[PDB]
Design a protein around this ligand. Structure first.
Ligand code: NAG
Length: 181
């Protein structure tokens, strides 16, 4: 029953070089990991048939887009780790539908931006790891500083690489009074 592209441990399954997201994952598996996967995108409703997942991991993947509602149908997901990936586009409602999500890590994806209200609706969120990215200080990321002021969750210090004059400036220290838009 363990998917061909995956190897299953005691309560966990790990998939390497998977050409597609398997929908036949055993129900007893509560966390899933995708490493160097073949598929280039996460379309909406991909995890609908694996509702038992409490933790999800994506590492060493190259993703064109992670679209809206990709993680819909994951009510029990408390942990989502997307790290060490090449992600060209992340969508506003990507994480919509995860109200049990506790720890979310987008660290080390070399992302240059995040869409507004990407963390809206994540109520159980106690920690967010945005470190290790290529964020550029702009007006469109403006919302982020506001979200960093009014957020419960613990978010470690992150910095914008550009513009070159404002390189390595503390995103957490940044305030609405600093950027003119
Ligand atoms: C975090 O938010 C919840 C409601 O979503 C609230 O009950 C709780 O007091 C907040 N934690 C704080 C303010 O430390």
């Amino acid at each position: 029953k363990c998917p061909a592209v995956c190897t299953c441990s005691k309560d966990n399954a790990l998939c390497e070089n998977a050409r597609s997201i398997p929908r036949t994952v055993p129900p007893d598996v509560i966390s899933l990991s995708f490493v160097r996967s073949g598929f280039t995108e996460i379309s909406e409703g991909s995890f609908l048939f694996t509702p038992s997942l409490q933790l999800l991991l994506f590492t060493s993947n190259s993703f064109d887009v992670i679209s809206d509602d990709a993680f819909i149908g994951l009510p029990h997901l408390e942990y989502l780790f997307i790290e060490n990936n090449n992600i060209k586009s992340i969508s506003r409602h990507t994480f919509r539908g995860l109200k049990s999500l506790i720890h979310l890590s987008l660290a080390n994806n070399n992302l240059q931006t995040l869409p507004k209200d990407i963390f809206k609706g994540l109520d159980s969120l106690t920690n967010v790891d945005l470190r290790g990215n290529a964020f550029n200080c702009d007006c469109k990321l403006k919302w982020l500083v506001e979200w960093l002021g009014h957020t419960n969750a613990t978010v470690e210090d992150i910095y914008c690489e550009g513009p070159p004059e404002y390189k390595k400036r503390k995103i957490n220290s940044l305030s609405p009074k600093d950027f003119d838009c």
